[PDB]
Amino acid sequence: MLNPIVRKFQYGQHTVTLETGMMARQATAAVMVSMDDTAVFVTVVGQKKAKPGQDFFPLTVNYQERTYAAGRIPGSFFRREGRPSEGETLIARLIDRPIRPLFPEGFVNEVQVIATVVSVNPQVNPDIVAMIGASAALSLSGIPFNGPIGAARVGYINDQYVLNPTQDELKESKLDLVVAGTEAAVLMVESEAQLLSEDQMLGAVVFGHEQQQVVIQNINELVKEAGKPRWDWQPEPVNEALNARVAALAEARLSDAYRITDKQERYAQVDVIKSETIATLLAEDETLDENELGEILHAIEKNVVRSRVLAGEPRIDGREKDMIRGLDVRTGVLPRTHGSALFTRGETQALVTATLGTARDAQVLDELMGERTDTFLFHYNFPPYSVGETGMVGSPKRREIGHGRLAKRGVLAVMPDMDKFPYTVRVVSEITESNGSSSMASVCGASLALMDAGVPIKAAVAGIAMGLVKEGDNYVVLSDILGDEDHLGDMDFKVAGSRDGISALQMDIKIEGITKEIMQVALNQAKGARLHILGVMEQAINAPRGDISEFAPRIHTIKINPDKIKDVIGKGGSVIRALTEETGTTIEIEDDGTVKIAATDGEKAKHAIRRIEEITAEIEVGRVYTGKVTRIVDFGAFVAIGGGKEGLVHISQIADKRVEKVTDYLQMGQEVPVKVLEVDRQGRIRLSIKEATEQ
């Protein structure tokens, strides 16, 4: 017999029902969380034996949208769900980023959270359900875990926040925000707004957290009822003796080494002191593990840089907390792309390039909620020659598929509606050099490229990453944190928006609790920095160009009869294939008879127009048709005319005189007008050169 421990409550409008104990009894824990007929079956399994000699914590969060949830057989050729799509990877990262800071420091047991989507209802997004389920499952399992973390989605409709809006409500909403936080403080935010002020975004965050408190309480109650006993896991007791021994020699020397302005001399000096210290540590006692010394050195460097930045001393870069690194904006750097730009900020650089295409190129996304065509593709490539180290290129890693979406949220607020711009822009952004805040450099470069290719975006956008170092009640916000500073910064949040409002927000706070006031001050400083960046960017190019680049495919429209569109289709599309091959353009066909002629140069456009038009023009009374006899036989020559319908001039209908040889009557290359009296349907169209040959 099976004893399913079910616990259901009320969340917003829907009724979440947590249900454990019945399935996957062999995994460490598994809950089937269902909200309003959308059910996600999350399950956690964490090994007990620490892998001997581990340095990083290996948490993986697979998320699978099984397409039998909506109730459809998959569309792939193998008829089976395969590699996870970009959406599923995005939601996996969205589940991953809240929980990882909650596992206590010094935990290195492999833990894997496989949240599959068994059933979906089109109004309720499964992702929030999966997040709630992941938190509930982790809390039930007894793996060392500090929060039972809720998830909430808030939307802005009629200036009033709505919790967990349905997709139809979401279409009206200005802002879509996901806030996942512990009982104590927010723990992550991943937004996409529509140029809202900072106060509105902050209110949304605080509202979502204050409301998801309920899910948190109820998961705690379930854990208390039917959870497993907590693991007997103790962090490695801090070897204060060795730490103090290394510190007594290293503290002042590394403080002064970091105190000097030049970066590379400090690099070399601290590396040689590191070599000296590890040499002494090994020589004095071989048994001491190398990774322990590495951790000690990491602690020393982190501590010294944090103590420095807290006291107000200039950062490792040498800038004040406000100062943004110098920028250099370049546009049209690529000769033949539809539009390109190169946004270098400090050491972070991005070569962004926007390319227009016709509606046939829009990605057709087949996801659980519904089929959806995308007419704005943003891809973000992070090649390994950026950081400075070799590495195998390949399919995009999760972080690239996450930052692609982040930059796309950054730019989506200002893209034009399809009726105003009937193209499908695709923006790529290769990161030639990275030193921190790469995705926001990509947002700036994408705004630049779009403004250059000729897209009529509303206003340029720019993104500035930020940081925050807090100890006790003393906190200093950091602007444009470097890659090195990112380790030090407690909270990393990225703000990207036009001058008016915030297009996208992506907080990722990690330590203790940050008061609303802290977030407000940080957001205001980010607004200032973003205004400065936008000014500098406006100095280079202030308004999108007049028209698209000459290479860009222009749009030409022609109207044709509905049967004629079938005629131009032909057998499986042979006529259209031949037409595009001979003219070199791209033609789109609709059932209502509109024709979309898309070609770069107007000459190819008019070539397509004339070539198609000859077939489009119906045979009309009085007007002669141009026909060339392709084959001559002794018993008659038929003048092939085209259009699927050929009229034959039988040997008995040419003249009453005995036609002896067609060669002496019709010569190779005889372009003569043919008198067509009518168009018959029986397939024997009457052609007559006799009336045209009398004169």
Which stretches of the chain bind RNA, using CB under 7 A? 74-77, 82, 360, 366, 565-566, 569-573, 576-577, 589
By CB atoms closer than 10 A (0-12, 13-18, 19+), residue 452 is: buried
| Shortest Cβ 390–a copy of itself spacing (Å) | 4
Distance CA 666, CA 664 (A): 6
Rounded-to-integer distance, Cα 249 and Cα 275, Å: 14
**CB of residue 449 vs RNA: minimum separation in angstroms?**
24
- Per-residue contact track with a copy of itself, 527 to 556, x per CB under 8 A? ------------------------xxx---
Q: Which is nearer to RNA, 571 or 658 (CB)?
A: 571
Q: What is the DSSP string of 338-402?
A: SEEEEEEETTEEEEEEEE---GGGSEEEE-SS-EEEESEEEEEE--TTTTT------SPPHHHHH
Both tokens of 612, joined, read 């198609």
| C-beta of 33 vs 368, nearer to RNA | 368
Binding residue for a copy of itself, selected from 64, 280, 653, 670, defined by CB under 8 A: 64
Q: Give the interface segment with a copy of itself, choosing from 114-122, 260-268, 490-498, 657-665 (CB under 8 A).
A: 114-122
For Mg ion, give the closer residue by CB, 331 or 435.
Answer: 435
CB of 210 to a copy of itself, least distance (A): 30
Do the beta carbons of residue 555 and residue 598 sit within 8 Å?
yes
The one of Mg ion, RNA, a copy of itself, none whose footprint includes residue 589, by CB under 5 to 8 A per kind, is RNA
- β-pairing, 59-60 vs 111-119, is parallel
Q: What residues contact 268, with CB distance under 8 A and at least 6 apart?
A: none
Q: Annotation-wise, does 486 bind a ligand? A: yes
Beta carbon of residue 256, minimum distance to a copy of itself (angstroms, whole number): 27
Please give the structure tokens belonging to residue 334: 């690529």
| By the rule CB under 8 A, 566 interacts with a copy of itself | yes
Q: Is 286 in the site for a copy of itself (CB under 8 A)?
A: no
Taking CB under 8 A as the criterion, the residue among 337, 438, 447, 585 binding a copy of itself is 337
Q: How far from each other are the two terminal CA atoms of the chain, in whole angstroms?
A: 102
Q: Does 119 bind a copy of itself (CB under 8 A)?
A: yes
Residue 63 host element (H or E): strand 63-65
H or E stretch covering 4: none
* Enclosing H/E stretch for 339: strand 339-345
Tell me if 331 contacts a copy of itself by CB under 8 A.
no
Dist CA 202 CA 238 (whole Å): 39
Burial of 561 (0-12, 13-18, 19+ CB in 10 A): exposed
With contacts defined by CB under 8 A, name the span among 283-291, 329-337, 471-479, 493-501 that binds a copy of itself.
Answer: 329-337
Q: In the complex, what is the shortest distance from the CB of residue 8 to a copy of itself, in angstroms, rounded to a whole number?
A: 13
229 binds, among a copy of itself, RNA, Mg ion, none (CB under 5 to 8 A by kind): none
List binders of a copy of itself among 387-426 (CB under 8 A). 387-393, 395, 424, 426
Among 34, 166, 438, 442, binds a copy of itself (CB under 8 A): 34
The entry of a copy of itself, RNA, Mg ion, none that residue 576 binds, CB within 5 to 8 Å by partner kind:
RNA
Q: Which of 235, 1, 196, 208 is nearest to 103 (CA)?
A: 235
CB of 646 to RNA, least distance (A): 15
In the block, tokens 């141009």 appear at 626
Angle at 549 between CA 545 and CA 550, to 5 degrees: 140
In three-state secondary structure terms, 419 is coil
By CB under 8 A, residue 619 contacts a copy of itself: no
**Identity of the residue, 295 or 361, whose beta carbon is nearer to RNA in the bound complex:** 361
How many CB atoms are located within 10 Å of the residue 472 CB?
7
Which 8-state DSSP code applies to residue 229? P
User: Among 350, 523, 381, which Cα is nearest to 448's?
Assistant: 350
- Are the CB atoms for 402 and 408 separated by under 8 Å? no
- Per CB under 8 A, which region of 73-81, 127-135, 228-236, 610-618 contacts a copy of itself? 73-81
Q: Please name the residue that has the structure tokens 């927010």.
A: 186
Residues contacting residue 510 through CB under 8 Å, at least 6 positions apart? 101, 187, 490, 491, 492
CA distance to 247, 272, 415, 677, per residue, from 257 (Å): 14, 11, 48, 99
Q: Does 108 bind a copy of itself (CB under 8 A)?
A: no
Q: Number of residues in contact with a copy of itself, rule: CB under 8 A?
A: 107
Contact between 192 and 175 under an 8 Å Cβ cutoff? The reply is: yes
Is the CB of residue 612 less than 8 Å from the CB of residue 568?
yes
Minimum gap (Å) between residue 112 Cβ and a copy of itself:
4
CB 368 within 8 A of CB 85: no
Q: Which two tokens stand for residue 362?
A: 């829009």
Q: Taking CB under 8 A as the rule, does residue 606 contact a copy of itself?
A: no
Q: Does 38 bind a copy of itself (CB under 8 A)?
A: yes
User: The tokens of 588 are what?
Assistant: 């789109």
How far, in Å, CA of 416 to CA of 453, rounded? 14
For residue 440, the minimal CB distance to Mg ion (Å) is 9
For position 579 contacting a copy of itself by CB under 8 A, the verdict is no
Q: Which does 436 bind (CB under 5 to 8 A by kind): RNA, a copy of itself, Mg ion, none?
A: Mg ion
Window of 144-152, 250-258, 286-294, 327-335 that interacts with a copy of itself by CB under 8 A: 327-335
Write down the least CB distance from residue 454 to a copy of itself, Å.
13
- Give the dihedral of Cα atoms 437, 443, 446, 448; nearest 10 deg: -90
Distance in Å, CB of 19 to a copy of itself, minimum: 10
Residue 110 partner contact from RNA, Mg ion, a copy of itself, none using kind-dependent CB cut-offs of 5 to 8 Å: a copy of itself
- Using CB atoms within 10 A of its CB, is residue 218 exposed (0-12), middle (13-18) or buried (19+)? buried
- Residue closer to RNA (CB basis): 56 or 77: 77
Sequence-distant (≥ 6) Cβ neighbours of residue 407 within 8 angstroms: 378, 380, 429, 439, 440, 442, 443, 446, 463, 496
B/e letters for 135-158, b = 16+ CB within 10 Å, e = fewer, are bbbbbbbbbbbebbbbbbbbbbbe
Residue 150 sits in the site that holds a copy of itself (CB under 8 A)? no
Instruction: Pick one of Mg ion, a copy of itself, RNA, none as the site partner of residue 430 (Cβ within 5 to 8 A by kind).
Output: a copy of itself
Min CB(129)–RNA separation in Å: 23
User: Of residues 600, 653, 670, 688, which one binds a copy of itself by CB under 8 A?
Assistant: 600
Residue 482 gets which letter from DSSP? Answer: -
Please pick, from the candidates 6, 8, 110, 558, the single residue that binds a copy of itself as defined by CB under 8 A: 110
Q: Would you count residue 438 as binding a copy of itself (CB under 8 A)?
A: no
Q: Minimal CA–CA distance to 387: which of 333, 354, 321, 431?
A: 431
Tokens 């949040």: give the residue: 493
Q: Which of Mg ion, RNA, a copy of itself, none lies near 25, with the C-beta cut-off 5 to 8 A by kind?
A: a copy of itself
Nearest residue (beta carbon) to Mg ion: 486
Give the shortest CB-437-to-Mg ion separation in angstroms: 5
Chosen from Mg ion, a copy of itself, RNA, none, partner binding at 258 (C-beta under 5 to 8 Å by type): none
379 contact, one of a copy of itself, RNA, Mg ion, none, CB 5-8 Å limit per kind: a copy of itself
Q: Is 218 in the site for a copy of itself (CB under 8 A)?
A: no
Is 6 one of the binding residues for a copy of itself (CB under 8 A)?
A: no
Minimum CB distance to Mg ion smaller for 99 or for 478: 478
The footprint of Mg ion (CB under 5 A) covers 436, 465, 481, 486, 492
For the annotated binding site, the residues are 486, 492
Q: Which residues are annotated as a binding site for Mg(2+)?
A: 486, 492
